[PDB]
Each structure stands twice: as C-alpha cells, then as structure tokens.
Symmetry: C2
Subunit: 419 residues, 2 copies
C-alpha cells in the first residue's frame, strides 16, 4: 500500500528466493544429468539432449494446469475467499489434459524426431518409455508447484524440489539411458506423494465449474511457451547458416543466461503472486507500488549480473570451451547481452504481474508481437549486408529493451481504467 522499500522487498525476497532456488536446482539437475549420460556414449548424449530440448513443446502445454491455478489462487487468497474449489478443479484439469500425452504423446515425439538418425530415435524411445507413464503425475506436481506459489508459500516447493532433485540424481546414478528417464519418473512420483502427504493431512496447500476460467486463462500461456520455442528455434537456425563453431556457442550462452532466466522467473512468479493477491483484494494502488519497487530492485540485481557478464567474458567459459575462435564469440555474446539484462528484469516483472492480475492473454501479445517486429525480422532483413553473428545478438539486446518498454507502457494504461 505505502510500506517503504525494505518492507516490500522483504515480503518479496522471502518468497522469490525459493523459486530462484527451485529453478537453479533444475539447472544443476539437468547439467549433472548431462554429465551422467555423458559417461555412456556420444549417441546417448545426442538422444538425451535432443529429446530433452524437444520436450519444450510437450513439456510446455502444462501452462494450463500451472497458470490457470496460479493466477486464480492468488486473487482468491487476496480476497480472503476459500481457494479450495480451484485446487480440486486444478488437479482435475491437469489430469484431464495430461491424458492426450499419456497415449498419443510419445508417438508424437517420435514423429517429430523423424522429421538426427534412426538409432537416436530408438534410444530416445527407451529414454521416454517410463517418462510418459507418469506424465499425469508430473502434471499434478506442476499444478501443486503452481498452487503453493499462489498462496505465498514457495518454501514448500523449495524443500520438495531439493528432495525431488536429490532423488532424481540418485536414482539416475544407480540405474545408469532408460535409467535416466526412470530418474525423472521416480522423482516425480516421490514429489507427488510428498505433496499428497502434506495436503490432505496437514492441509498445507489448502483445506465447481470454473473450468471456463482456468482454461481461458491458461490457454494463452500454453500458446506463448510453445509458439515461443518454435520462434526461438527459427532465430537459432539463423545462426546455423554461417559456420558451426559460432553455432555451438549459443548452446553455452543458454546456460550462461540460464541463471539470470531462473532468477527473473522466480521474481516473475513472485510478482505474479503479489499482483494477484493485490488485485483480488481490490487493492490496485497497492500492486502498482509493489510491482514498481520489485522492478526497481530486480533491475539493480540484473544490472549487477549483466555487468558481471560484460566484465568477465572468457572467465566464465574456460571450463566449458578451451580453443581459439570460441572465447571470442561467447565473449562478444555476453558483452552484447550484458546491457539488456535490466530490460529482462522489467519485462519479466511486468509480464508476470499482469498474469497474476488476470491479463494472461497479454504476454503472447507482447512477446510474440514484439519478437518478430523487432528481433528476427530486422536481422532477417539486414543480415544480407553484414555477414557476422553480431547482428542477431545486438538486435536481441535492442529488442529486449523495446520489449521492456512495451510492458511498462501497457501496464500504466491497464491500471488507469482500474482507478
């Protein structure tokens, strides 16, 4: 409402560091899994990495189960209303939409893999056979992880994520390509049963025809994620035309940015929860200042981090790559993407804040509508003059800025009609 800086960032950080921890644990989990399957064969690593980096399209439709619950429970707890009929319907919706992935889901993935090699797909079949048996289990765990975030108790998914990733890595270590998928499956079932023992017993998540609501709210994000993975695939294929050495540096820049993506996504889910609990309580002038201060602080954090990127180029990639004409490209990458990290703070906060406010159809109209018009398209037009990979990266950096002043200038006007 009008509580000062320290007060609002205390209520933020204590519920945003847990999501940062969860996402960084996911990063560590997948890196250690890459290392675990690296001790098999380059073909096994190819299969595993391609099948994992391809699920961001299947493992991307659960934005219904996640968002349709996260958005509603925030406004319901904010308004002090019983947020019980959403957990039941949230779990029912997750289990309902996870079924078309149980059956014709892995076959869809094999179909997409055909469009690589043939042995790689046959090994990916072994890797995905146990994963798809417990896909509704993963949908339920995701609905839980999206419901605890709405009630303002992210420490519980933090603890459960520590448990789940430890179990994942341990079971994969024991069984190790099929055991690597058994790791995911067993981790998901264990985290799900832990959530169940926490739920019905000590009602810690919480103690019926809003399927319209959560469907209509989660469908836009379910779009955004998949239609962004495809778009970024086009943008990545842009770099494939000129050389394969520069091509493999974007896969390192992925992890370099991954920590900041995880931090911003944590402070995005947190700002989502905050904006939702203020909008539901009919406390709009509260969420204005709340997201304002959260953005002002996360922008300083991101300034510091993206400045680390600029000031320490090679001295973050030495363990990764150690050869000429590589440190140059990853370095120029970081130095170019260093500037556009505060903008990622603003574009994460404001977009996640509208999500909590209910404007879930806005992100795909600021992410997809930005993207092309300012990056990809202008580098798919200029790139016939300058034949160097600095064009897509510099345009990336400029476009994250103009996207960051999309969100800001579409936030001000949305709250105007509210007052």
């Amino acid at each position: 409402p009008n509580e000062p800086y320290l007060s609002v960032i205390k209520k933020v950080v204590k519920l945003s560091i847990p999501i940062i921890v969860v996402n960084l644990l996911y990063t560590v989990e997948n890196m250690i899994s890459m290392i675990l399957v690296s001790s098999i064969s380059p073909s096994a690593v190819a299969a595993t990495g391609f099948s994992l980096s391809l699920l961001w399209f299947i493992y991307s439709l659960m934005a219904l189960s996640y968002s349709g619950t996260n958005i509603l429970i925030a406004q319901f707890v904010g308004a002090k209303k019983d947020p019980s009929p959403i957990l039941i319907n949230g779990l029912f919706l997750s289990f309902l939409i996870s079924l078309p992935l149980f059956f014709y889901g892995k076959d869809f993935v094999l179909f997409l893999m055909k469009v690589a090699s043939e042995t790689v797909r046959s090994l990916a079949k072994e890797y995905l056979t146990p994963i798809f048996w417990f896909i509704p289990i993963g949908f339920l765990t995701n609905t839980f992880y999206g419901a605890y975030n709405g009630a303002g108790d992210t420490k519980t998914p933090m603890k459960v994520a520590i448990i789940m990733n430890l179990t994942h890595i341990g079971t994969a270590y024991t069984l190790i390509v099929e055991g690597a998928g058994w790791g995911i499956a067993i981790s998901e079932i264990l985290a799900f049963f832990i959530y169940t023992f926490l739920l019905i017993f000590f009602k810690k998540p919480f103690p019926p025809k809003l399927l319209f609501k959560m469907v209509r709210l989660g469908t836009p994000t379910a779009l955004e994620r998949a239609i962004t993975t495809l778009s970024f695939n086009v943008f990545v294929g842009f770099l494939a035309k000129f050389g394969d050495k520069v091509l493999a540096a974007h896969q390192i820049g992925l992890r370099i940015e991954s920590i900041s993506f995880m931090i911003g996504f944590g402070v995005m889910i947190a700002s989502t929860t905050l904006a939702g609990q203020n909008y539901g309580a009919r406390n709009y002038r509260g969420m204005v200042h709340a997201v304002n201060t959260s953005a002002h602080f996360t922008a300083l954090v991101m300034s510091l981090t993206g400045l680390i990127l600029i000031l320490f180029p090679h001295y973050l990639v030495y363990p990764f790559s150690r050869d000429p004409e590589v440190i140059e490209w990853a370095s120029y990458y970081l130095q170019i993407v260093g500037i556009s990290q505060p903008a990622m703070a603003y574009a994460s906060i404001y977009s996640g804040a509208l999500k909590g406010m209910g404007k879930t159809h806005i992100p795909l109209f600021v992410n997809i509508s930005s993207f092309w018009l300012f990056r990809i398209i202008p580098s798919y037009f200029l790139l016939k003059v300058i034949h160097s990979p600095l064009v897509p990266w510099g345009f990336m950096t400029f476009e994250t800025a103009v996207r960051a002043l999309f969100y800001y200038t579409v936030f001000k006007k949305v709250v105007g009609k509210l007052l």
Copy 2:
C-alpha cells in the same frame, strides 16, 4: 432485425432467404474442387496424389485465413446491428489479411514441400509457385466475403462465387490442355486457374467498393484477439482429426476408401449447416449490438430447429439410400458395405449437426469466440477419440456420432446460460 415475437414462418422465410447465397458459395466450391481434381486426373497419377494431398494440406494452410474473416465477419455484424459506422472496420480488416499473408508469401512455398514427408513433390512445386504469388489477393477476397455476409448481403458473394467458378472453366480446362494454343502448364495450370480466379473476383470486389461505394464508404488488437481463437479452432482440429483417422487407418485401403468417400457424400449434405451457421452468426451479431437480446434468442431458437428438421430429412435420405450414394464412387463391394454402414452412423448425427453449427455460429456473433475453441477440442478427446481408444470400425464411427451429439447438449447449455444472463 428479428423482434422477440415474429411468427416462426416470418423468420424461417427470412433465414433461408439469406442462408441460400452462402449455401451457393459453399456449393459450387465443391464443383470447383471436383472439376479441378478431374482435370488433374486427366494426366499423371502422381498429379492426382499431389493435388489431393495439396488441397487436403491447403485446408490447414487456410486456417490462418479466418483471422481476417472472423475478425470482420463478427464485428461488422454488430456494427451494422447497432447502426454504427462500419467502414473503418472494413478497411482495417482488408488491410490485415494482406499484411498477415506475406508470411505465407516468400517463406511458405517450400514449407509445403517440407511438411510433405519424389516426382510428386516436384509436381507440388509446379503448383505452389503461382498460387502463393497472389495469395494476398485471395486473403483479401476472403475478407471481402466476410464483410459481405457480416453486413447482411450474401447474394453479392454468391454471384462473385459463380463468376469465379466459371473462371475455373477455360482458365483451367484450357491452361491444363491448351485449346487457346497456350503451352500445357501441366499441374501448374491448376495453380494459375485458382490464382486467376481470385484476380477476377478482386476486380468485381475492388470495383463495387469504389464505383458503387460497395455498401459503404488504431485498434485492430480487437480483431486479432477475435480471430486468433477461430484460427486455433480450425488449425488444431484438423491436426487432431488426423489423429482420429489413424484409428481407421489400421484396416487397409478398403476402409480408407470408405472414410474418404464418406467425406465426399458428407460434404454434399454439409453445406446446408455451414451456410445456416454463417447466417446465424450474422443474425446473432446484428441483434446483439442492437440490444435486441430476446429477438436474438428467438431467431437462433427458430433457425436451430428449422435446420434440425432439414438435417433430419437429409440424414433420413442418407440412411435410407446409402447404397445408391456410394455406387457412383465405389465398385469394390466391401467398400460399398463399409460406406453404407458409415452413412447409417452419420445420418443419425445429422440433426445434431444442426444445433452444433447454429449455436457455434451464434456465439461467434456475440463476441465469445473462444467457446468453439475449447468446446470442439475438449469434446474430441473426452468423447470421440478416447472412448473409441478404450473399446477397440463401427466403434470409432458410432462414438463420432454421439460425440457430435453430446457437442449439441454442451453448445446449448453454454448458450442458454450465457444468453439468459444477458437478460
């Protein structure tokens, strides 16, 4: 346009007066595609296969075509209904298709070859080179369509469709063969024959709005937010219906022939509902903006049951005489028995395809355009694709029927709970 107490006959005469031009646009297109298939069938078998899979693929490519249509079909309906000036909507709807069709221009011709997984592909190349050349013109023409059925004037797109179809004889029959001494374009002829047909309609279409001021003389985010869910409804259902045809694909070509000919015999007795659906969209839009909610309900309630009677007669014809409808298209007997057993399963659902179509169009007029997205999708899996998976050729078809019958009682209750709370 219809008041809350017109005696049914009064509107039943004023809905079949308006729906018939839409029915003639939907028909004659059937003849266009039939005659084009035959003309291409006059040459190579690979040409037949390539053209068939192209038109069945250009169904999906055209799913990004409703965004300009649904954006201008619905809006104008309300704008004309609420006696508000709908001209800027017209220009911002025409300029939208063009602007949004160049993504299909340039990188979009090889996209088809990409998705089509040898001579067959090369024949698709000499086919998808001149059509995509004038594809913005076709998008604009479909937007002109949309505008005309929205404003309530469907007879003009009827005449335009007639003249375009007549442009598919000559600029086709000739350009394929070569009576005019012109070189045999081969399959490419069937390309130009489509492309050229748009140009003609463009003239007539771009003529009336200047010379005769058509019927009449920012914020397109509205139009885009309306058109995107319809594009999803027509882009995801195509995909996911192929996941249902995989069910029947497990019995050989003799059942694929049954389903493929069912598509045809169906289509013949399909345009009725799609025409009345566009008409009911227009009616519900023109009454929603005019605050005539009771009259809107009365119109949709009367037209739904009238179309139910018509489709009951139609399904009865399909059930009583299936053998004679398949005799034109099949000589292998087992195919005959499968197609007859199929039409007896569809003809039942025919009356239930009137309520679905009418209520589907009706909720489009009154903004709510995400309804048919999560109504026609959450029904596939839940009722036709899964309950057929757990019981496995009459199981999948008999569940198709009752799915598009439970889609009736689902479209309705939503419609009634939405429209009773309008009052």
